[PDB]
Amino acid sequence: XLXRXXX
Amino acid sequence: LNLDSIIGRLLEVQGSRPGKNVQLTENEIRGLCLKSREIFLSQPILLELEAPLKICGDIHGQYYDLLRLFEYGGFPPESNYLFLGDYVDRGKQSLETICLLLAYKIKYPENFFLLRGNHECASINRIKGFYDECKRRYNIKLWKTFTDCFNCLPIAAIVDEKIFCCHGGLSPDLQSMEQIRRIMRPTDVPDQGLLCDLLWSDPDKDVQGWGENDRGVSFTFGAEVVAKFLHKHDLDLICRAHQVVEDGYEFFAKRQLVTLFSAPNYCGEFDNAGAMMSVDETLMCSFQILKPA
Ligand SMILES: [Mn+2]
Ligand SMILES: [Mn+2]
């Protein structure tokens, strides 16, 4: 969920 | 280069409250980059390693968890180590993390090994934190010096002719190990092709063959791709990193592939542990785990 380049 | 002084100062903060910095000099960090770069270029791009050894996945600047990993596994050279990449970005201490890793590579170049992850690439770590850390704590000239070093990291490793290791995963273009050995350095990571896939691809339980990858680059691959690759190259196991897994390690395709992720508490959508894999003298695999906070 951090942004799917990636939780 | 006073390597021992550098290592001592990096280790000095063991037992401090997490977050306490180690600020090496610009000249020391440049020496670490230049010397490690020469060692990377003198060793093969496809490493051939021997167990026993410890294998770690992503660290992402979580320096105090790197220190815990060494506390659990033994500080170099008490144990041999292979890291699978993604040393920088996201975490608050990418600089301490990569400097200790490079210092140990120079100090124990035959017993300590680092692979390239997709974040050891200027296009990625420009935007995911490492550029900002370098600009804040040093200058952008040092970030370029890091980039030159990252562009020379090896790409894959085979442990005792049985465990194939890389950061991301398999490639539809990977037919022979000689294709990896032919890759020339320095290189950037391309946005497609063999080198891209080795650093970016993912296994997927719901894909048959090769699929599209939600990251926007490279591919996914299924359990049958793994089995055929293992059979074709006479391997027992694929060991890779790159994906956050809740237990720190996660098996795939009937334990023919394992994902390692070594940075605990990385992710806001779910808790995760960090794991380090022990490979013993018979190639049996076990785990040491940093449980989530
Ligand atoms: Mn990655
Ligand atoms: Mn990562």
PDB file of all heavy atoms in Angstrom, chain A residues 6, chain B residues 58 60 86 118-119 167 242-243 261 266, ligand 2:
ATOM      1  N   UNK A   6       6.188  -0.978  -4.408  1.00  0.00           N
ATOM      2  CA  UNK A   6       5.973  -2.028  -3.450  1.00  0.00           C
ATOM      3  C   UNK A   6       7.251  -2.366  -2.580  1.00  0.00           C
ATOM      4  O   UNK A   6       7.801  -1.463  -1.926  1.00  0.00           O
ATOM      5  CB  UNK A   6       4.838  -1.730  -2.513  1.00  0.00           C
TER       6      UNK A   6
ATOM      7  N   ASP B  58      14.973  -8.193   1.189  1.00  0.00           N
ATOM      8  CA  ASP B  58      14.966  -6.726   1.186  1.00  0.00           C
ATOM      9  C   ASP B  58      15.252  -6.147   2.570  1.00  0.00           C
ATOM     10  O   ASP B  58      14.723  -6.628   3.574  1.00  0.00           O
ATOM     11  CB  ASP B  58      13.609  -6.176   0.717  1.00  0.00           C
ATOM     12  CG  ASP B  58      13.175  -6.702  -0.647  1.00  0.00           C
ATOM     13  OD1 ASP B  58      13.677  -7.732  -1.137  1.00  0.00           O
ATOM     14  OD2 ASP B  58      12.301  -6.053  -1.238  1.00  0.00           O
ATOM     15  N   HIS B  60      15.794  -2.254   2.680  1.00  0.00           N
ATOM     16  CA  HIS B  60      15.156  -0.943   2.495  1.00  0.00           C
ATOM     17  C   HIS B  60      15.470   0.033   3.634  1.00  0.00           C
ATOM     18  O   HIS B  60      14.577   0.587   4.282  1.00  0.00           O
ATOM     19  CB  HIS B  60      13.645  -1.104   2.310  1.00  0.00           C
ATOM     20  CG  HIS B  60      13.262  -1.600   0.948  1.00  0.00           C
ATOM     21  ND1 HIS B  60      13.618  -0.935  -0.206  1.00  0.00           N
ATOM     22  CD2 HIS B  60      12.570  -2.694   0.553  1.00  0.00           C
ATOM     23  CE1 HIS B  60      13.150  -1.591  -1.254  1.00  0.00           C
ATOM     24  NE2 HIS B  60      12.511  -2.663  -0.821  1.00  0.00           N
ATOM     25  N   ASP B  86      17.774  -4.566  -2.880  1.00  0.00           N
ATOM     26  CA  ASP B  86      16.864  -3.602  -2.252  1.00  0.00           C
ATOM     27  C   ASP B  86      17.382  -3.183  -0.869  1.00  0.00           C
ATOM     28  O   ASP B  86      16.752  -3.408   0.168  1.00  0.00           O
ATOM     29  CB  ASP B  86      15.430  -4.151  -2.175  1.00  0.00           C
ATOM     30  CG  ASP B  86      14.663  -3.999  -3.504  1.00  0.00           C
ATOM     31  OD1 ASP B  86      15.301  -3.645  -4.515  1.00  0.00           O
ATOM     32  OD2 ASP B  86      13.428  -4.260  -3.535  1.00  0.00           O
ATOM     33  N   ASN B 118      15.844  -4.186  -7.687  1.00  0.00           N
ATOM     34  CA  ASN B 118      15.305  -3.169  -8.590  1.00  0.00           C
ATOM     35  C   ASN B 118      15.432  -1.757  -8.014  1.00  0.00           C
ATOM     36  O   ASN B 118      15.383  -0.786  -8.776  1.00  0.00           O
ATOM     37  CB  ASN B 118      13.838  -3.479  -8.971  1.00  0.00           C
ATOM     38  CG  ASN B 118      12.920  -3.533  -7.785  1.00  0.00           C
ATOM     39  OD1 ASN B 118      13.237  -4.150  -6.771  1.00  0.00           O
ATOM     40  ND2 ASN B 118      11.766  -2.872  -7.896  1.00  0.00           N
ATOM     41  N   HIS B 119      15.650  -1.613  -6.704  1.00  0.00           N
ATOM     42  CA  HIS B 119      15.884  -0.281  -6.158  1.00  0.00           C
ATOM     43  C   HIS B 119      17.324   0.179  -6.276  1.00  0.00           C
ATOM     44  O   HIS B 119      17.586   1.367  -6.050  1.00  0.00           O
ATOM     45  CB  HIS B 119      15.433  -0.205  -4.696  1.00  0.00           C
ATOM     46  CG  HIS B 119      13.947  -0.239  -4.541  1.00  0.00           C
ATOM     47  ND1 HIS B 119      13.218   0.850  -4.110  1.00  0.00           N
ATOM     48  CD2 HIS B 119      13.046  -1.226  -4.782  1.00  0.00           C
ATOM     49  CE1 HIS B 119      11.932   0.537  -4.092  1.00  0.00           C
ATOM     50  NE2 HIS B 119      11.802  -0.718  -4.489  1.00  0.00           N
ATOM     51  N   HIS B 167      16.992 -11.295  -7.323  1.00  0.00           N
ATOM     52  CA  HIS B 167      16.107 -10.426  -6.554  1.00  0.00           C
ATOM     53  C   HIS B 167      14.643 -10.643  -6.920  1.00  0.00           C
ATOM     54  O   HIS B 167      13.797 -10.849  -6.043  1.00  0.00           O
ATOM     55  CB  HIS B 167      16.466  -8.956  -6.754  1.00  0.00           C
ATOM     56  CG  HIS B 167      15.549  -8.049  -6.007  1.00  0.00           C
ATOM     57  ND1 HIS B 167      15.616  -7.904  -4.637  1.00  0.00           N
ATOM     58  CD2 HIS B 167      14.481  -7.321  -6.416  1.00  0.00           C
ATOM     59  CE1 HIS B 167      14.656  -7.082  -4.240  1.00  0.00           C
ATOM     60  NE2 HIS B 167      13.957  -6.710  -5.299  1.00  0.00           N
ATOM     61  N   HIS B 242      11.983  -9.370  -3.006  1.00  0.00           N
ATOM     62  CA  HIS B 242      11.236  -8.445  -3.861  1.00  0.00           C
ATOM     63  C   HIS B 242       9.783  -8.227  -3.429  1.00  0.00           C
ATOM     64  O   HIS B 242       9.245  -7.131  -3.622  1.00  0.00           O
ATOM     65  CB  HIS B 242      11.329  -8.965  -5.308  1.00  0.00           C
ATOM     66  CG  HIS B 242      10.752  -8.064  -6.351  1.00  0.00           C
ATOM     67  ND1 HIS B 242      11.029  -6.718  -6.422  1.00  0.00           N
ATOM     68  CD2 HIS B 242       9.957  -8.342  -7.412  1.00  0.00           C
ATOM     69  CE1 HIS B 242      10.400  -6.197  -7.460  1.00  0.00           C
ATOM     70  NE2 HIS B 242       9.744  -7.162  -8.079  1.00  0.00           N
ATOM     71  N   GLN B 243       9.145  -9.218  -2.800  1.00  0.00           N
ATOM     72  CA  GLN B 243       7.753  -9.094  -2.366  1.00  0.00           C
ATOM     73  C   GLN B 243       7.634  -9.195  -0.854  1.00  0.00           C
ATOM     74  O   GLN B 243       8.201 -10.105  -0.242  1.00  0.00           O
ATOM     75  CB  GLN B 243       6.873 -10.183  -2.991  1.00  0.00           C
ATOM     76  CG  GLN B 243       6.414  -9.881  -4.381  1.00  0.00           C
ATOM     77  CD  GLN B 243       5.436 -10.922  -4.901  1.00  0.00           C
ATOM     78  OE1 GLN B 243       5.752 -12.117  -4.986  1.00  0.00           O
ATOM     79  NE2 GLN B 243       4.230 -10.472  -5.238  1.00  0.00           N
ATOM     80  N   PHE B 261      12.003 -11.809   2.719  1.00  0.00           N
ATOM     81  CA  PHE B 261      11.853 -10.372   2.928  1.00  0.00           C
ATOM     82  C   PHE B 261      12.355 -10.084   4.331  1.00  0.00           C
ATOM     83  O   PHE B 261      11.817 -10.632   5.296  1.00  0.00           O
ATOM     84  CB  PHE B 261      10.392  -9.932   2.787  1.00  0.00           C
ATOM     85  CG  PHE B 261      10.221  -8.456   2.585  1.00  0.00           C
ATOM     86  CD1 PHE B 261      10.248  -7.915   1.308  1.00  0.00           C
ATOM     87  CD2 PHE B 261      10.030  -7.605   3.671  1.00  0.00           C
ATOM     88  CE1 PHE B 261      10.088  -6.543   1.114  1.00  0.00           C
ATOM     89  CE2 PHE B 261       9.881  -6.244   3.485  1.00  0.00           C
ATOM     90  CZ  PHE B 261       9.912  -5.710   2.209  1.00  0.00           C
ATOM     91  N   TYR B 266       7.356  -3.265   7.595  1.00  0.00           N
ATOM     92  CA  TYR B 266       7.602  -2.462   6.403  1.00  0.00           C
ATOM     93  C   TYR B 266       6.345  -1.792   5.869  1.00  0.00           C
ATOM     94  O   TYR B 266       6.432  -0.752   5.207  1.00  0.00           O
ATOM     95  CB  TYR B 266       8.188  -3.374   5.329  1.00  0.00           C
ATOM     96  CG  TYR B 266       8.436  -2.784   3.957  1.00  0.00           C
ATOM     97  CD1 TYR B 266       9.594  -2.063   3.689  1.00  0.00           C
ATOM     98  CD2 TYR B 266       7.537  -2.999   2.913  1.00  0.00           C
ATOM     99  CE1 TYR B 266       9.843  -1.553   2.429  1.00  0.00           C
ATOM    100  CE2 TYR B 266       7.779  -2.499   1.640  1.00  0.00           C
ATOM    101  CZ  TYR B 266       8.935  -1.777   1.406  1.00  0.00           C
ATOM    102  OH  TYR B 266       9.204  -1.281   0.156  1.00  0.00           O
TER     103      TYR B 266
HETATM  104 MN    MN C   2      11.746  -4.267  -2.141  1.00  0.00          MN
END
